[PDB]
């Protein structure tokens, strides 16, 4: 249960190709003027109308 050769860069990156990625959630923030990822708190301490969190 071992490797025999080393590889060539292109096939490495091909394995890595459909090892692709995906992005963040996204919503808007106007209770404090940002754009948070969807279904979270915003940058400001608020998760919608009220500051559900402290300043920092």
């Amino acid at each position: 249960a071992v490797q025999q050769r080393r590889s060539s860069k292109h096939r490495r990156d091909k394995r890595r190709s459909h090892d692709a990625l995906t992005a963040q959630a996204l919503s808007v923030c106007q209770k404090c003027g940002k754009k948070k990822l969807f279904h979270r708190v915003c940058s400001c301490g608020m998760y919608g109308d009220l500051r559900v969190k402290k300043a920092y």
Binding site: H39, R40, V41, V52
Partner: protein
């Protein structure tokens, strides 16, 4: 398993649950995992809904949920709670609280959720 980690097990979880429910009593606010915040919240709602018969058996049982704190005790939290908190919540059909989605950890980049509730 090589005499290393036992990790997470139901007794550890339930001990943490009892401790942090005692905590939120002391505070009314916890910054935990949702997977744990909501999980606690079911038993929390149970206790809330059941706390308001306000009897000595209620005392003897809610005894089974607390310890010594930096802030409160059994005798202090229990009493204050019984005195003032319950009826303002006696009229709604469950869902007493909110777990709300903060940002994730720094220590592990894991999604911290805040468990709280306001009258």
């Amino acid at each position: 398993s090589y005499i290393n980690k036992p990790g997470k097990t139901s007794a550890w979880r339930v001990m943490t649950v009892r401790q942090q429910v005692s905590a939120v009593l002391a505070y009314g606010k916890i910054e935990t995992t949702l997977k744990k915040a909501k999980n606690t919240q079911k038993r929390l709602d149970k206790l809330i809904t059941l706390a308001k018969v306000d009897n000595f058996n209620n005392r003897r049982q809610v005894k089974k949920w607390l310890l010594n704190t930096n802030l409160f005790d059994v005798d202090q939290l229990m009493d204050h709670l019984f005195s003032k908190v319950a009826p303002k919540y006696e009229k709604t059909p469950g869902g007493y609280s909110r777990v709300l989605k903060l940002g994730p950890r720094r220590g592990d980049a894991t999604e911290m959720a805040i468990l709280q509730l306001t009258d």
